[PDB]
Amino acid sequence: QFSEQVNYQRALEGELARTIETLGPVKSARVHLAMPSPSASVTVTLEPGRALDEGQISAVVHLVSSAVAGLPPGNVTLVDQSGHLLTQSNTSGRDLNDAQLKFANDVESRIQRRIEAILSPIVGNGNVHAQVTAQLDFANKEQTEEHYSPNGDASKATLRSRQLNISEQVPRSTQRNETSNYEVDRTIRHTKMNVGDIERLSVAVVVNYKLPLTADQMKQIEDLTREAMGFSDKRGDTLNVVNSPFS
């Protein structure tokens, strides 16, 4: 019964390593599994004069992380024929953070690619450059308001019950008890903010000469960029456009 779940694992390892071989840069792989939480250790041997890129590692990681039951991609270990541990594995902590750099590099790559496109026709195909910086927010934030509406005014209160004894005598020994149980308007927001929204934008744009550009001809260039960003003084965005001869 034990040599049942072992003669099988030895076949999985030999099957998983037959696909990683049929993968291009890899000449021959060699994978061992550790199923008792599980782990794996691929040992690819790249073709002569080749090296797996940064996104070609996740190809071989997920190729094994998914073909094995319950194996996260944080346990797969990839190693070349020249040492060179390619996976991160070893750090159980501050991985998955370059992701927040890649992402922030795309949020800015777009605003940049856009500003050039909306400004290249006016000033020329290559007479303008623009760089973008975006302070993002990755704080996992939640919220739960629970607003009520005031009912201090009788004219807009909503009684559910009400008791009201009003004695009197005449020695004007009066009296007035009262009870009240209200019902209350009750809103309940429950947000869960988006991880990756933009906190503040800062964009600098250089535009070539012609011979400088006219004051208005620049002011109208400033306002286009003010739109290609989504310039919002709420966020505290900062734009700075300058015209200067290129080289």
Which positions from 24 through 83 interact with a second copy, judged by CB under 8 A?
A: 24-25, 30, 32-41, 43, 45, 49-60, 62-77, 79-83
Residue 194 tokens read as 């988006």
Q: Toward a second copy, which CB reaches closer, 170 or 211? A: 170
Which DSSP symbol is given to 178? -
Does residue 94 touch a second copy according to CB under 8 A?
Answer: yes
CA dist., res. 67 & res. 40, Å (int): 11
Closest CA to 132 of 81, 201, 198: 201
Q: How many positions of this chain bind a second copy (CB under 8 A)?
A: 188
Sites for a second copy among residues 122-161 (CB under 8 A): 122-125, 129-131, 133, 135, 137-161
| Cα separations in angstroms, 119 against 83, 102, 127, 223 | 49, 26, 9, 11
CB of 48 to a second copy, least distance (A): 11
Considering the complex, what minimum distance in angstroms separates the CB of residue 215 from a second copy? Answer: 14
User: Which residues in 8-27 contact a second copy (CB under 8 A)?
Assistant: 8, 12, 15-16, 18-19, 22-25
Site for a second copy in 157-186 (CB under 8 A): 157-186
Supply 83's token pair: 């040492």
Rounded distance between C-alpha atoms, residue 12 and residue 101, angstroms: 36
CB of 208 to a second copy, least distance (A): 8
Q: Residue 211 Cβ, how far from a second copy at the closest point, in Å? A: 15
**Which of 94, 211 has the CB closer to a second copy?**
94
Shortest spacing between CB 220 and a second copy, in angstroms: 5
Look at the chain and count its residues.
Answer: 247
210 is a site residue for a second copy (CB under 8 A): no
- Please tell me the distance from the alpha carbon of residue 196 to that of residue 199, in angstroms, as a whole number: 9
Q: Which is nearer to a second copy, 145 or 211 (CB)?
A: 145
CA within 13 Å, CB half, 200: 7
* Window 221-240: residues binding a second copy (CB under 8 A): 223-224, 226-232, 238-240
CB 21 within 8 A of CB 29: yes
The distance of closest approach from Cβ of residue 19 to a second copy in the complex, given in angstroms and rounded to an integer, is 5
Q: Residue with structure tokens 């310039």? A: 231
C-alpha to C-alpha distance for 83 and 80, rounded to whole angstroms: 6
Please check whether residue 96 is in contact with residue 73, taking contact to mean a CB–CB distance below 8 angstroms.
Answer: no
Give 2 or 211: the residue with its C-beta nearer to a second copy: 2
CB nearer a second copy, residue 161 or residue 215: 161
Question: Considering only CA atoms, which of 36, 55, 44 is closest in space to residue 79?
Answer: 44
User: Which residue among 90, 211, 215, 233 contacts a second copy (CB under 8 A)?
Assistant: 90
